[PDB]
């Protein structure tokens, strides 16, 4: 049996009819869902069925596994290889318009996508007919519109990067915060350099790991994903690591903006040799996790540290992307009364990608200057 | 930064548990309470061990099970095991009363809430 | 091939030798130390192998891209050859020739920057030090822009296996068809020369069957993985 | 088997810590007859 939902909501919310600047608040919310439940023994009728639940036939997405097992219409095979599966997708597309000045138009956008797949095998206990989950796991995608302009114009090249220095520095702050979250301040936080955890001899394989970070907490090294992901986000968003969010996902999208200004022409350019003048600016930034998934190593067993002496993380991903784009950073499009029109445009972008497979930062920067002149010499005689 | 402290609560809970069930447990300077039922014929921080342990809560609800010998590095485990296992030889059995800070911490994980005392019965069968 | 015992610049008849071909897995470790040299990772501020590996400086960092930067200073610090030394620290490793200007014998010279005949000007054209000048207007023109790396198949990995097949041809004044893998000989009598004279020439065609190796070095039993081809000249007494 | 990366050189493994290095990969085996194309292969910048 398969189930699917395609929820969709659209709201214009015309703010019309000091805060009267906002005009329209366009809100789009799409929510797809789906459920695949194999091993469903009973058949269907001529006109259909409502045997699992009347909601499931119309897409309730509520838990029907345990009810189906209790009522006894799940397979009694104890080696069932088919997996119960659930899919969910959320898309939020908030949009707004602001008119702070008569010749100044502002467009704000807020984007948030979250996809989640859960898969699990199952059994039914021969006695009491109880549903038994077996090795459930989760994966999916995440993306949210953010603002990272606080570090956009900081110079970053082969020889210097203030944002990368902040990324280096925030690791210890985030590690200390995570250790205080883990060790509840009732005892001194164990560290790689203290007496209880001394630096081993040069033969021990952990000698290099222990030496590379002596003042860090035992479970939170410089290479821990949970340590350097919030550090990366705080460093390249301009936030302070002492209070920045340590969570993998974000809840509130940060608006991206587009500003148009046909305002300077109103000042004195009516007869100042200008017949057109407009400024344009765009900023769009996104923070994306292409594939996160649950960790089978994060379980109830006493084994809590990996080969790198890092605590196992609940959710693991290979890469995180911070994409920033001024498209354009500026656009001056002005036509003179002498038929000379000039369109200048500065565009900028950053494509930071932090990889936890090798703990490397790949920064792709791009700058583009475009200049366009148009002139018409009048009555040229050959 | 909204941390909790559980040292005193765990200590008093362990004292209450040892009052309810007539067991005498020696105290480690880190707060670990252990009872060695028997020894055999010590494993270090770099040593692979095999255990048939079983771990439960105060109420007796078992949170982790191992009826067959499972191999661990003894350096990847919780601190309570790191302080309890090196106290005995192969074939010996111990009962640990690991607090939160020596266990899964003040935040816990799935099925183990933060600030939970963990009672382990460990039978070390191999130090290979 | 052109017979070197016929023309004007013919070699003496006593200068016989052999040319060997090797087909298969051949070690990319040109300077045998177990480490992959790439000269785009060298420099004064780069981390080297803490004990110096028997041939000069070897970068300790993992190579990413086999490419130089455009900065001339980094190029000067980097384009120093496979030994990793900038011709002034080469005397510490190559102690028997430390009194020379080029102790390692790996300096590069442009063929238009040298003097003498055509062969004299190409004598140091394959040197790995100074062969990647940034500017094409340099009097010592680069002849390449890629750093010299001990990795020839561009798979980022340095192979150290020596399992190959070996073939060999003799180089003698009086070679004829039917032996030495010779299949054809074309004798050219009247060659017009730029100096107004004439010379004799002899072209020899060799066809060495791949399926009949003369020898097998290492453990190679088939031809399904032939990744490297080497040829070397030996046995000669004078310039050939 | 004894090639377990988790038990690299613990008590009776067939692997040393040198198995983690490209330079000393060959010396990373406690075995005797190990070849660089039969028993193992190495890549320095392999792409996922």
């Amino acid at each position: 049996i398969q189930n699917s939902n395609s929820n969709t909501l659209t709201t214009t919310l015309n703010m019309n009819t000091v805060l009267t600047s906002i005009k329209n608040v366009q809100i789009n919310y799409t929510k797809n869902s789906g459920t695949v439940l194999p091993g469903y023994t009973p058949s269907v009728g001529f006109l259909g069925t409502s045997k699992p639940s009347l909601g499931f036939v119309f897409g309730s997405q509520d838990d029907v596994r345990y009810e189906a097992a209790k009522r006894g219409w799940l397979t009694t095979y104890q080696d069932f290889n088919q997996s119960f599966t659930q899919v969910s997708n959320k898309l939020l597309k908030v949009t707004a318009n602001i008119d702070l000045l008569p010749d100044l138009k502002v467009d704000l956008s807020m984007d948030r996508s979250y996809s989640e797949n859960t898969s699990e095998q199952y059994s039914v206990d021969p006695s009491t007919n109880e549903y038994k989950p077996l090795s459930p796991y989760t994966y999916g995608m995440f993306s949210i519109s953010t603002v990272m302009i606080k570090t956009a114009f900081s110079p970053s090249d082969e020889t210097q990067s203030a944002a990368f220095d902040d990324f280096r520095s925030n690791r210890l702050i985030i590690a200390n915060r995570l250790a205080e979250g883990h060790y509840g301040s009732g005892v001194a936080i164990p560290r790689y350099g203290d007496a209880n955890n001394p630096i081993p001899a040069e033969t021990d394989p952990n000698y290099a790991v222990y030496t590379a970070n002596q003042g860090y907490p035992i479970g939170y090294t410089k290479s821990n994903q949970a340590v350097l992901l919030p550090a990366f986000l705080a460093a390249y968003t301009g936030s302070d690591a002492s209070s920045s969010s340590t969570n993998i996902f974000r809840s509130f999208p940060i608006p991206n903006w587009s500003i148009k200004y046909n305002g300077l022409m109103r000042y004195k350019y009516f007869k100042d040799k200008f017949k057109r003048f407009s400024l344009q600016h765009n900023y769009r930034a996104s923070y994306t996790i292409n594939q996160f998934r649950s960790n089978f190593d994060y379980n109830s067993s006493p084994k809590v540290q990996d080969v790198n002496t890092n605590f196992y993380n609940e959710i693991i991903m290979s890469n995180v992307n911070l994409v920033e784009q001024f498209s354009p950073l500026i656009r001056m499009d002005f036509e003179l009364k002498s038929s000379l029109r000039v369109l200048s445009e500065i565009k900028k972008d950053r494509a930071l990608s932090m990889s936890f497979d090798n703990n490397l930062l790949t920064e792709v920067k791009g700058m583009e200057y475009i200049i366009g002149l148009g002139y018409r010499f009048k009555d040229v005689i050959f | 930064d909204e941390v909790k402290d559980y040292t005193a609560e765990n200590e008093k809970e362990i004292v209450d548990y040892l009052a309810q069930n007539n067991l005498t447990a020696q105290r480690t300077n880190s707060g670990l309470y252990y009872i060695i039922t028997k020894e055999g014929s010590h494993p270090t921080l770099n040593s692979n061990i095999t255990v048939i342990y079983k771990g439960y809560f105060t109420n007796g609800k078992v949170f982790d099970e191992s009826t067959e010998g499972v191999s661990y590095s003894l350096r990847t485990l919780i601190p309570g095991w790191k302080e309890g296992i090196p106290l005995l030889k192969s074939g010996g059995e111990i009962q640990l009363f690991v607090p939160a800070h020596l266990g899964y911490g003040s935040n816990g994980n799935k099925t183990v809430p933060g600030g939970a005392v963990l009672i382990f019965e460990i039978t070390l069968v191999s130090v290979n | 091939v052109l017979d070197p015992y016929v023309g004007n610049g013919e070699s003496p008849a006593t200068n016989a030798g052999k040319i060997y071909f090797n087909l298969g897995e051949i070690s990319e470790d040109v300077l045998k130390d177990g480490r992959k040299q790439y000269e785009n990772g060298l420099g004064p501020d780069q981390v080297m192998v803490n004990p110096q590996p028997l041939w000069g400086d070897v970068p300790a960092s993992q190579s990413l891209i086999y490419a130089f930067d455009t900065n001339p200073d980094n190029r000067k610090n980097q384009d120093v050859g496979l030994d990793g030394l900038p011709s002034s620290r080469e005397g510490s490793i190559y102690t028997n020739y430390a009194g020379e200007a080029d102790p390692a014998g790996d300096d590069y010279t442009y063929y238009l920057n040298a003097d003498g005949g055509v062969l004299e000007r190409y004598k140091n054209y394959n040197g790995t030090e100074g062969n990647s000048a940034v500017s094409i207007n340099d009097p010592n023109r680069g002849s390449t822009t890629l750093p010299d790396v001990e990795d020839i198949n561009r798979d980022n990995t340095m192979s150290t296996i020596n399992a190959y097949y070996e073939y060999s041809i003799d180089v003698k004044p009086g070679m004829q068809v039917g032996e030495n893998y010779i299949t054809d000989i074309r004798e050219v009598t009247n060659v017009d020369l730029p100096n107004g004279g004439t010379t004799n020439a002899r072209w020899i065609q060799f066809k060495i069957p791949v399926s009949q190796p003369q020898n097998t070095i290492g453990n190679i039993t088939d031809f399904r993985s032939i990744r490297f081809m080497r040829m070397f000249m030996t046995g000669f007494n004078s310039q050939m | 088997n004894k090639y377990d990366p988790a038990t690299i050189g613990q008590a009776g493994s067939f692997l040393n810590s040198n198995i983690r290095e490209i330079v000393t990969a060959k010396s990373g085996f406690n075995n005797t007859n190990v070849s660089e194309a039969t028993d193992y292969s190495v890549l320095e910048n392999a792409r996922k």
Side-chain angles (χ1 to χ4, degrees), chain A residues 177 180-184 186-187 204 206 242 298-305 314, chain B residues 1 3-5 7 46 53 64 72 75-78 82 104-106 108-110:
Chain A
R177 290 178 58 197
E180 270 174 74
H182 186 271
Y183 317 94
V187 294
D204 210 4
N206 277 9
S242 300
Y298 189 79
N299 48 36
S300 54
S301 55
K303 189 188 187 303
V304 292
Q305 288 172 6
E314 196 183 9
Chain B
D1 293 333
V3 305
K4 280 73 176 175
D5 188 8
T7 51
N46 292 317
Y53 73 100
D64 190 61
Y72 287 134
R75 76 168 67 101
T76 69
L77 312 175
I78 53 183
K82 293 181 179 181
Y104 291 108
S106 301
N109 52 38
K110 300 209 214 323

Side-chain angles (χ1 to χ4, degrees), chain B residues 49-53 66 68-70 72 81 85 122-125:
Chain B
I49 62 172
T50 308
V51 289
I52 304 170
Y53 73 100
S66 170
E68 293 83 3
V70 62
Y72 287 134
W81 279 51
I85 298 297
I122 311 170
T123 301
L124 175 60
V125 307

